[PDB]
Amino acid sequence: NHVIFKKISRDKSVTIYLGKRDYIDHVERVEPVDGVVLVDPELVKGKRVYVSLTCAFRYGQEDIDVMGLSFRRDLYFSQVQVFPPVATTRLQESLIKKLGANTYPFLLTFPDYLPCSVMLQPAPQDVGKSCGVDFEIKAFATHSTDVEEDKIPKKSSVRLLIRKVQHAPRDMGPQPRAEASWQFFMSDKPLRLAVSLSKEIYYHGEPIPVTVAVTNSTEKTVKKIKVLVEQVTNVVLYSSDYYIKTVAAEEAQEKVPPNSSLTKTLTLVPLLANNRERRGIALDGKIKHEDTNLASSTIIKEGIDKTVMGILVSYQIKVKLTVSGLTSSEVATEVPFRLMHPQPEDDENFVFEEFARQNLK
Amino acid sequence: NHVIFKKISRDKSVTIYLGKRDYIDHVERVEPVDGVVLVDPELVKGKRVYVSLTCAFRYGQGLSFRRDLYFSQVQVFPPVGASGATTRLQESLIKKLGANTYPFLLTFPDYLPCSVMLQPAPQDVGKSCGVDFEIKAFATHSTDVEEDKIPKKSSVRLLIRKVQHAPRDMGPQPRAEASWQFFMSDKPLRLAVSLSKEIYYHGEPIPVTVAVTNSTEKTVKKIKVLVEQVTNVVLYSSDYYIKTVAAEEAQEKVPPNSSLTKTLTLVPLLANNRERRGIALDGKIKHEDTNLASSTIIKEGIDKTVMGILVSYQIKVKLTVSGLLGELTSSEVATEVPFRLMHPQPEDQDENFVFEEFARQNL
Amino acid sequence: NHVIFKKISRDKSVTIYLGKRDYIDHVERVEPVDGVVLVDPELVKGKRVYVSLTCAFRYGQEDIDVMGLSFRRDLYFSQVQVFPPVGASGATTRLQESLIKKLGANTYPFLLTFPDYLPCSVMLQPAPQDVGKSCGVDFEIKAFATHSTDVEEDKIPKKSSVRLLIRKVQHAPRDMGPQPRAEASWQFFMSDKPLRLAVSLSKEIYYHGEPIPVTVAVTNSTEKTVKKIKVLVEQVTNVVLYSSDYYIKTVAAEEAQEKVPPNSSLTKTLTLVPLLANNRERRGIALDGKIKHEDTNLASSTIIKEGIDKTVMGILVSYQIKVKLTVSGLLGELTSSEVATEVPFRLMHPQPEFQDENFVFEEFARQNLK
Amino acid sequence: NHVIFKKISRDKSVTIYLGKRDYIDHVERVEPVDGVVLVDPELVKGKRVYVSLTCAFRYGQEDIDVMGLSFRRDLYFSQVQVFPPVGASGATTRLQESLIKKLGANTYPFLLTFPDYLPCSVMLQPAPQDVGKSCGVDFEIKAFATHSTDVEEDKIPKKSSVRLLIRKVQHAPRDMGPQPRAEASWQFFMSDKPLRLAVSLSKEIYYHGEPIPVTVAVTNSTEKTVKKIKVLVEQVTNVVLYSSDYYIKTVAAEEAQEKVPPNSSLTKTLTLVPLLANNRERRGIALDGKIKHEDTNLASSTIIKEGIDKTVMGILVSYQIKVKLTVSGLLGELTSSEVATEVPFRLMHPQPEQDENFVFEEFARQNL
Ligand SMILES: O=P(O)(O)CP(=O)(O)O[C@@H]1[C@@H](OP(=O)(O)O)[C@H](OP(=O)(O)CP(=O)(O)O)[C@H](OP(=O)(O)O)[C@H](OP(=O)(O)O)[C@H]1OP(=O)(O)O
Ligand SMILES: O=P(O)(O)CP(=O)(O)O[C@@H]1[C@@H](OP(=O)(O)O)[C@H](OP(=O)(O)CP(=O)(O)O)[C@H](OP(=O)(O)O)[C@H](OP(=O)(O)O)[C@H]1OP(=O)(O)O
Ligand SMILES: O=P(O)(O)CP(=O)(O)O[C@@H]1[C@@H](OP(=O)(O)O)[C@H](OP(=O)(O)CP(=O)(O)O)[C@H](OP(=O)(O)O)[C@H](OP(=O)(O)O)[C@H]1OP(=O)(O)O
Ligand SMILES: O=P(O)(O)CP(=O)(O)O[C@@H]1[C@@H](OP(=O)(O)O)[C@H](OP(=O)(O)CP(=O)(O)O)[C@H](OP(=O)(O)O)[C@H](OP(=O)(O)O)[C@H]1OP(=O)(O)O
Ligand SMILES: O=P(O)(O)CP(=O)(O)O[C@@H]1[C@H](OP(=O)(O)O)[C@H](OP(=O)(O)CP(=O)(O)O)[C@H](OP(=O)(O)O)[C@H](OP(=O)(O)O)[C@H]1OP(=O)(O)O
């Protein structure tokens, strides 16, 4: 029972059908956009219909009594002709049969040098504005003299904001633990902190087992041990904005007294659900939408300038130790890991729905 | 030479006189409705006459949805207390009309919208809606212990306007900056837009200064500047209208690696629009004194929904760029700058009165 | 039980009484000098007695014999007549009324006011290492008798005079500056990675003897170790009359025990108390009095009033917290410089606030050390 | 004859002597720093004296009741030993041999070389209107003495040290090809009628103080009038470390008298000289030194070497000729249109080229 997503132009001349809202990037390759356009042949007589895939970085938000700063960089544009008709997929063949002889297929492919769906709406505390990377599928009709005035009439056009979602690659090597250790000399006596994760890549919703090994050879007491998942966001187009937000936290009970050692494994789950405040954090969609999650770790390909990703998103485990004096001192350290969606999957019956995404309560 | 507006009940028992058709809202306060009722003392014997001010939102062409936003009522007959006029207009009208003339004062609060209404075009989904202001003078009587009655024939209703005039304050000089980097181009196209001020008056020309800095290898073929009216119905139905009420297409092109500064002047006017449907007006399409609706001014700590219809204006600047549309984009290169549109600031022996029917002139 | 300070002239003809040795400047206004002069009416017969308030900057040693050894700039002079009694002659303040009653009918009041454009008690005696000489701002209260001779020359004998070196002490205003904060970062030669130092104090004004909590946040993203974190209170002294002398001296230092290893951060609060007591060597530092005296402290921060030329302050005194980070494999290898930042703060004394009082009398001369 | 620049440590134990304040970068190579250190052998007994060359980018300024934001990136560090005399600078120069003879046997030579990947002396103090802070690239020559346990306590005592802020000045290379005119043209269609603007400079590289002849050729085939022709030298400054600050300032301007009426053409040559002297306001512009100093000029054009990331230059400085044409409104308007175009050029100092007689001066630079 395959759910198909449809949207219709104002003038009802062009209707677009997609198999998915979300298209999978699994590093090796990206799932292409295969869909169909249903034209009203009366309302398209002597007209040409195209479908475009645009990836664009945007920066700026509407503020009263504040100068309107807007900025757009297109990171990819591609366009094909659907009408008049110029290999097909099985989804297209099936949709054409179900919809009629006014149905025409399109295939738009993604390249390997694009980011995934990342966007950010700032909090009151934050300097810097709303920014994001959008993916638009737009089907539109041109007239014969419309190309001659360079005009693309709105009522004959339909646009869909699809997501490019980061999944893990399908074949992966065995995963080395993500582990570091530090020796904090205090009065020439070492306080040793070792932090270790089970693996390097975790999935959204998957629990992260953080093993913390405090070896205290000092005459000071470790009063408190806090473990965070921090999300680090670097806007690398237009404005060098920096965000660092806790998306999961555990403050253990333990003290580590002088000349003793303590090993402890806390489990954290970095989830958007944990965060009442959904602003100041990199998401893969709008705050209002239900299917919106935390942004996956940016995966910069070799010999690609990171600036063309628009927004860099990374995750790290932060361990804060509160150490006594005779006011106390805090030491902290970071262990990086990557967060993304699971590996992808190794007649018909179509139910049709509006593309518009569901909201929250 | 003060023109006074009069209307008489069917039964000629109640006649209402107003100084104005239109009452000024200038944000700080709203001009109250000061008028007089002339009763035929024979035809109101043993009867009570009241005057009411009702503000209501309506939606539909039978009668589909009504929300009352304000109601107030006073007694004119028999005379309440002192019964002496409050304003000079009343004192003067009482003297000119006779001892059967009785004053009324109905005040506006600060939480109401101004006269806004909308009749949709064929292309538009959603129905006729508006905010009406009714001044109604009517007589009540009793022929039974069990009920009072309000005959229609003893009543007279006037549809006044609450017109938005400018405050003392103005917002900061509105300015926008936008830049685009098109696919495979290392070079930005920069658009800066500036207006002289934040508040313009109906009929006043709007000087839109446009600064196109073209560092690209493409040509800016066209620069179009619009005044767009944005209408949001915020009661019953979330209807949205966006209509051009003024447009100017500059002659200049901006070639590669050049910049052009240019000031286009627009005047957003109802007169510019043959099609008077699909746009927020301050009155009915048929009436002569009807204009474009003024910008809604929502007061602090007032829920916008009680305004019924939100009206805003913006300058839109569209750049048509060579060899993208089809090749490198399916989108439009445009930015918006908001501004407010309303009527000018207010100006801050006896008179000579000419009397006219309240009914408004047509086209 | 109010202690009153008295000094008597050599010839015992003029005795001066003050409520205080030290008079409070709290920025808004300055405490005036209210005192009384007790004359021996036999020894002042046909004579006039005056009291003067002089503020003067000096540079050099004190003039000896006839030699001008010193450079002197008078910053303020005022004088009043105490004898014979001027007009009403009745006390102005309660301290005067009370002293007159206790001492007798040969007691006469004086009031000398301070203006708003003067510095506070600041002086400096240089160390061997220092170039530049002894300098200071003195405040002299001098009561003296004049008489006339047969030739029309008036005389002012030293034996008929008494001079007191009072202090003008800086107490805090009502206002305080914003919480002082600094941020510094370094990227060393051949390093892609910053070393970030953030420094914060609890407040902008501290009092003499009050502990200063210096919060230090070292974020070390480098592959080098922060071997040492040293926190100083530095006193910066600028002589702005006669000679452009400059002194910068540590008056408090704390060396934290913690190191900050590669790819770690450390937040830490060290407490310092800038005190003259901490300094064995009392030379090369701005004091509010002489080294030998007990009640002598560090000079308060100079507070220059708006539209007053700083040169008329004579000696400018300021304080700052300096944080020095010692980083492994730099000094000699990647830098010949120091990794440090400064945060300014002001140091001064705390804010100010039917029967007679009970008076104990003491010599004005200040106590010394042991 | 030869003026030598000297500075002495507080404790008079170390004195440094340099041939120049300013060392020439002419793209091919950079003039090395050859000098001598005069030690007081009593005050350096059992001590080691070094001389370092540091190039550092700095960002931030002291503001009252404002948080102190400071940032330093070292772009080059090098150090040699002068005392005791175990030879480090290798072979000697004639300037050193001569200074050693004139000063005595307590004089020791040092040679510190510049690499090819450094910027030249550039710094900037912002104006009120400007958003970002003071920044610059400094070049420090520092001679300092260490004790035997000073290296062990990581301490460099200030009184035993002397630091000089030298300049790295951008001169033109010695061999250059013949110079093509720097010329562009634009066609501004107005109502489908072209307004043609051609701008031409004599050459691509000009020297500080050299006049720039800007030839402007307006061919007006439109029905509009060119009311005004303004020609500027604009300095464009991009801070490319810590903060992406941008400055664009006029350092020379000429507003011609001429109008160009409909269906006519006008050629005209204005001469501009971009000079710091022209600018009362010395803030918001890239200089090669401090505002207060006399020998301070406008910063030379940054010259980015092949395969060098521009970010390691710290501050990018470029110059351009801007031509603004004011074109009339047509049928009785109350505002006219401005079109403008830029022509880039580079600004720098001219190409470079027995016992001497030495006069000694304090290194400290003269003021205004
Ligand atoms: O987020 P969803 O789209 O699932 C909810 P909704 O319908 O309200 O979204 C509208 C969207 O309309 P459409 O569904 O694409 O036809 C608008 O799009 P259109 O009317 O189709 C085209 P537009 O951008 O208005 O020119 C525009 O979309 P977007 O720019 O935010 O993606 C609005 O944005 P804005 O008015 O807040 O600026 C956005 O509003 P919002 O989501 O905040 O309610
Ligand atoms: O509208 P106001 O009362 O403020 C002043 P006016 O005298 O002009 O109003 C009459 C109206 O009178 P009333 O409501 O019976 O007192 C008519 O009312 P009636 O014919 O008696 C029906 P109503 O009383 O409105 O329920 C009818 O009202 P409407 O059609 O505009 O609603 C007329 O319009 P139309 O006959 O030209 O179409 C309308 O005149 P308009 O100014 O709109 O031209
Ligand atoms: O829904 P609304 O009424 O608000 C918009 P509408 O359909 O009227 O507008 C287009 C307009 O472009 P746009 O849709 O506003 O962007 C066209 O604009 P273009 O001249 O093609 C270029 P634009 O899209 O404005 O940049 C041109 O009108 P106009 O804007 O020139 O007045 C069209 O008219 P036509 O000459 O193709 O028949 C006109 O359509 P029509 O008047 O037929 O309904
Ligand atoms: O120019 P500034 O005043 O800012 C520093 P300078 O080189 O003059 O001061 C040093 C000081 O160095 P620093 O304060 O850590 O930079 C020494 O300190 P370190 O090199 O850190 C020795 P430490 O291990 O801290 O005792 C030690 O001063 P300190 O120890 O009393 O603070 C010295 O004095 P000494 O006791 O060796 O004669 C003292 O010399 P002085 O200025 O008195 O001539
Ligand atoms: O700059 P020149 O040497 O040409 C003139 P001057 O003798 O007045 O130099 C002072 C002085 O430098 P030095 O180390 O004693 O030679 C200062 O020296 P310190 O601040 O005491 C040197 P330190 O901190 O010990 O390294 C500081 O030197 P610097 O800024 O050039 O490094 C001043 O600069 P700043 O603080 O105003 O910016 C600097 O210039 P000023 O502005 O006072 O005229």
CSV table of C-alpha atoms in Angstrom, one decimal, chain C residues 96-334:
chain,number,residue,atom,x,y,z
C,96,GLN,CA,33.3,72.7,66.9
C,97,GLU,CA,30.4,73.7,69.4
C,98,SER,CA,31.5,70.7,71.6
C,99,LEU,CA,35.3,71.4,71.4
C,100,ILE,CA,34.7,75.2,72.2
C,101,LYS,CA,32.7,74.2,75.4
C,102,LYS,CA,35.3,71.7,76.5
C,103,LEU,CA,38.4,73.9,75.8
C,104,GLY,CA,37.3,77.4,76.9
C,105,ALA,CA,36.6,80.9,75.5
C,106,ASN,CA,40.1,81.1,73.8
C,107,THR,CA,38.9,78.4,71.3
C,108,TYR,CA,38.0,79.7,67.8
C,109,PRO,CA,36.5,77.6,64.9
C,110,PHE,CA,37.7,77.2,61.3
C,111,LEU,CA,36.1,75.5,58.3
C,112,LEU,CA,38.3,74.8,55.2
C,113,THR,CA,36.4,73.1,52.3
C,114,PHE,CA,37.9,70.8,49.5
C,115,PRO,CA,36.9,71.4,45.8
C,116,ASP,CA,36.0,68.5,43.4
C,117,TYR,CA,39.1,68.9,41.0
C,118,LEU,CA,41.8,67.6,43.4
C,119,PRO,CA,43.5,64.2,43.5
C,120,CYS,CA,43.6,62.0,46.8
C,121,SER,CA,46.7,61.4,49.0
C,122,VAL,CA,49.3,59.7,46.6
C,123,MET,CA,53.1,59.5,47.1
C,124,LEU,CA,55.9,57.3,45.8
C,125,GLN,CA,59.6,56.7,47.0
C,126,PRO,CA,61.5,54.9,44.2
C,127,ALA,CA,63.5,51.6,44.5
C,128,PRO,CA,67.1,51.1,43.4
C,129,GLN,CA,65.9,49.6,40.0
C,130,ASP,CA,63.7,52.6,39.3
C,131,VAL,CA,64.7,55.8,37.4
C,132,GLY,CA,62.9,58.9,38.6
C,133,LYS,CA,62.7,60.5,42.1
C,134,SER,CA,60.4,60.7,45.1
C,135,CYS,CA,57.1,62.6,44.4
C,136,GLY,CA,53.7,63.0,46.0
C,137,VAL,CA,50.5,65.1,46.6
C,138,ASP,CA,50.5,66.5,50.2
C,139,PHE,CA,47.6,68.1,52.0
C,140,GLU,CA,48.8,70.7,54.7
C,141,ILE,CA,46.5,72.2,57.4
C,142,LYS,CA,48.7,75.1,58.8
C,143,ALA,CA,47.6,77.4,61.7
C,144,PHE,CA,50.0,80.4,62.1
C,145,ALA,CA,50.1,83.9,63.7
C,146,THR,CA,51.2,87.1,62.0
C,147,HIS,CA,52.3,90.4,63.7
C,148,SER,CA,53.3,93.9,62.4
C,149,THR,CA,56.7,95.6,63.2
C,150,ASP,CA,57.7,99.4,63.5
C,151,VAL,CA,58.9,99.4,59.8
C,152,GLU,CA,55.8,98.3,57.8
C,153,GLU,CA,56.9,94.6,57.4
C,154,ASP,CA,54.5,91.9,58.8
C,155,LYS,CA,56.2,88.8,60.2
C,156,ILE,CA,55.2,85.0,60.3
C,157,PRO,CA,57.4,83.2,62.8
C,158,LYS,CA,57.8,79.4,62.5
C,159,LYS,CA,57.6,79.2,66.3
C,160,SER,CA,54.0,80.7,66.2
C,161,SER,CA,52.9,78.1,63.4
C,162,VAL,CA,51.6,74.5,63.5
C,163,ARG,CA,51.3,72.4,60.3
C,164,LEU,CA,49.4,69.0,60.0
C,165,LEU,CA,49.9,66.7,57.0
C,166,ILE,CA,46.2,65.3,56.7
C,167,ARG,CA,45.2,62.7,54.0
C,168,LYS,CA,42.4,63.0,51.4
C,169,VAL,CA,41.3,59.4,51.3
C,170,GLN,CA,39.3,57.9,48.3
C,171,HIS,CA,36.0,56.2,49.5
C,172,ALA,CA,33.6,54.6,46.9
C,173,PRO,CA,30.8,56.5,45.2
C,174,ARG,CA,27.1,55.3,44.9
C,175,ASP,CA,27.7,54.1,41.3
C,176,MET,CA,29.8,51.0,40.2
C,177,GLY,CA,31.1,50.2,36.7
C,178,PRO,CA,29.8,47.1,34.8
C,179,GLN,CA,31.3,43.7,35.8
C,180,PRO,CA,34.8,43.7,34.3
C,181,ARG,CA,35.5,40.9,31.7
C,182,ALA,CA,38.3,40.2,29.1
C,183,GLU,CA,38.6,37.5,26.3
C,184,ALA,CA,41.9,36.8,24.6
C,185,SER,CA,42.9,34.0,22.1
C,186,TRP,CA,46.2,33.0,20.5
C,187,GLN,CA,47.0,31.0,17.4
C,188,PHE,CA,50.8,30.2,17.7
C,189,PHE,CA,53.1,29.8,14.6
C,190,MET,CA,52.3,26.5,12.7
C,191,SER,CA,49.2,25.8,14.9
C,192,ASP,CA,45.7,25.7,13.3
C,193,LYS,CA,44.2,25.6,16.8
C,194,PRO,CA,43.3,28.5,19.3
C,195,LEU,CA,44.2,28.8,23.0
C,196,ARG,CA,41.3,30.9,24.5
C,197,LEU,CA,41.5,32.8,27.8
C,198,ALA,CA,38.4,34.4,29.4
C,199,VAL,CA,38.8,36.4,32.7
C,200,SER,CA,35.9,37.7,34.9
C,201,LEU,CA,35.8,39.6,38.3
C,202,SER,CA,32.7,39.7,40.6
C,203,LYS,CA,32.5,43.5,40.4
C,204,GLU,CA,34.3,46.7,39.1
C,205,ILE,CA,35.1,48.4,42.5
C,206,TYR,CA,37.0,46.5,45.3
C,207,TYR,CA,37.9,47.8,48.8
C,208,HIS,CA,41.4,47.8,50.4
C,209,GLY,CA,41.6,44.4,52.3
C,210,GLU,CA,38.6,42.9,50.3
C,211,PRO,CA,39.4,39.7,48.5
C,212,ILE,CA,39.2,39.8,44.6
C,213,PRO,CA,37.7,36.6,43.1
C,214,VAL,CA,39.4,36.3,39.6
C,215,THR,CA,37.5,33.6,37.5
C,216,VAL,CA,39.7,32.2,34.7
C,217,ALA,CA,38.4,30.0,31.8
C,218,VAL,CA,41.3,28.5,29.8
C,219,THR,CA,39.9,26.6,26.7
C,220,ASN,CA,43.0,24.8,25.3
C,221,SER,CA,42.3,23.5,21.7
C,222,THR,CA,46.1,23.3,21.0
C,223,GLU,CA,48.4,20.2,21.2
C,224,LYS,CA,50.5,22.2,23.8
C,225,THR,CA,50.0,22.1,27.6
C,226,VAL,CA,49.3,25.2,29.8
C,227,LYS,CA,52.1,24.5,32.4
C,228,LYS,CA,51.2,27.5,34.7
C,229,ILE,CA,48.4,30.0,35.3
C,230,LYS,CA,49.7,33.1,37.3
C,231,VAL,CA,47.2,35.8,38.3
C,232,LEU,CA,48.6,39.2,39.4
C,233,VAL,CA,47.2,42.5,40.8
C,234,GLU,CA,49.4,45.1,38.9
C,235,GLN,CA,49.5,48.7,40.1
C,236,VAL,CA,50.2,51.2,37.2
C,237,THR,CA,51.5,54.6,38.3
C,238,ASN,CA,52.0,57.6,35.9
C,239,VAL,CA,53.6,60.8,37.2
C,240,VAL,CA,52.0,63.5,34.9
C,241,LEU,CA,53.8,66.6,36.4
C,242,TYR,CA,57.5,67.6,35.8
C,243,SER,CA,58.6,64.0,34.8
C,244,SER,CA,56.7,61.4,32.8
C,245,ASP,CA,57.8,58.6,35.2
C,246,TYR,CA,56.0,55.1,34.7
C,247,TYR,CA,55.9,52.3,37.4
C,248,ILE,CA,54.1,48.9,37.0
C,249,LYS,CA,54.4,46.7,40.2
C,250,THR,CA,52.9,43.4,41.3
C,251,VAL,CA,51.1,44.0,44.7
C,252,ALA,CA,49.5,40.5,44.8
C,253,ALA,CA,50.3,37.2,42.9
C,254,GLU,CA,48.7,33.7,43.0
C,255,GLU,CA,50.1,30.7,41.0
C,256,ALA,CA,47.3,28.0,40.5
C,257,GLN,CA,48.3,24.3,41.0
C,258,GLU,CA,46.3,23.1,37.9
C,259,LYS,CA,47.8,22.6,34.4
C,260,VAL,CA,45.5,22.6,31.2
C,261,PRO,CA,46.5,19.7,29.0
C,262,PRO,CA,45.9,19.5,25.2
C,263,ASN,CA,42.3,19.5,24.0
C,264,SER,CA,40.9,20.3,27.5
C,265,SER,CA,39.3,23.4,29.2
C,266,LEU,CA,39.7,24.5,32.9
C,267,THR,CA,37.5,27.1,34.8
C,268,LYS,CA,39.1,28.2,38.1
C,269,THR,CA,38.6,31.1,40.6
C,270,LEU,CA,41.8,32.4,42.3
C,271,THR,CA,41.3,35.0,45.2
C,272,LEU,CA,43.9,37.8,45.5
C,273,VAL,CA,44.1,40.6,48.2
C,274,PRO,CA,46.2,43.6,47.1
C,275,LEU,CA,47.8,44.8,50.4
C,276,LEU,CA,50.9,46.9,51.3
C,277,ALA,CA,51.5,44.2,54.0
C,278,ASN,CA,52.2,41.6,51.1
C,279,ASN,CA,55.1,43.8,49.9
C,280,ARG,CA,58.4,43.7,52.0
C,281,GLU,CA,59.8,46.2,49.5
C,282,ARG,CA,57.4,49.3,50.1
C,283,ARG,CA,59.4,51.4,47.5
C,284,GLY,CA,58.4,51.7,43.8
C,285,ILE,CA,54.7,51.6,44.7
C,286,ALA,CA,52.1,54.4,45.0
C,287,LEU,CA,51.0,54.7,48.7
C,288,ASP,CA,48.5,57.2,50.5
C,289,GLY,CA,51.2,58.1,53.0
C,290,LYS,CA,54.9,57.6,54.1
C,291,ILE,CA,56.5,54.1,54.2
C,292,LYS,CA,57.4,54.5,58.0
C,293,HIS,CA,53.8,55.2,59.1
C,294,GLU,CA,51.5,52.3,60.2
C,295,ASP,CA,48.1,53.7,58.8
C,296,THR,CA,49.8,54.0,55.3
C,297,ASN,CA,48.1,51.8,52.6
C,298,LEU,CA,48.3,51.3,48.8
C,299,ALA,CA,47.0,54.5,46.9
C,300,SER,CA,43.4,54.2,45.8
C,301,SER,CA,42.5,54.3,42.0
C,302,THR,CA,42.7,57.9,40.7
C,303,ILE,CA,39.2,59.1,39.7
C,304,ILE,CA,39.5,61.9,37.1
C,305,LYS,CA,36.4,64.1,37.0
C,306,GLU,CA,34.9,65.0,33.5
C,307,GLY,CA,36.5,68.1,31.9
C,308,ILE,CA,39.5,68.2,34.4
C,309,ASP,CA,43.0,68.0,32.8
C,310,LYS,CA,44.6,64.7,34.3
C,311,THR,CA,47.9,66.6,34.7
C,312,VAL,CA,46.4,68.5,37.8
C,313,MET,CA,46.1,65.1,39.6
C,314,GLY,CA,49.9,65.0,39.6
C,315,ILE,CA,50.1,61.1,40.0
C,316,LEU,CA,47.7,58.8,38.2
C,317,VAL,CA,47.2,55.4,40.0
C,318,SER,CA,45.3,52.5,38.3
C,319,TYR,CA,44.9,48.7,39.1
C,320,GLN,CA,44.4,45.7,36.8
C,321,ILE,CA,44.3,41.9,37.1
C,322,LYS,CA,47.0,40.3,34.8
C,323,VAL,CA,46.6,36.5,33.9
C,324,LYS,CA,49.8,35.0,32.5
C,325,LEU,CA,49.6,31.5,30.8
C,326,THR,CA,52.9,29.6,30.5
C,327,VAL,CA,52.5,27.3,27.4
C,328,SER,CA,54.8,24.2,26.8
C,329,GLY,CA,57.3,24.4,23.8
C,330,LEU,CA,56.8,28.1,23.1
C,331,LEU,CA,59.4,30.4,24.8
C,332,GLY,CA,62.5,30.1,22.5
C,333,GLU,CA,60.8,27.8,19.9
C,334,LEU,CA,57.6,29.7,18.6
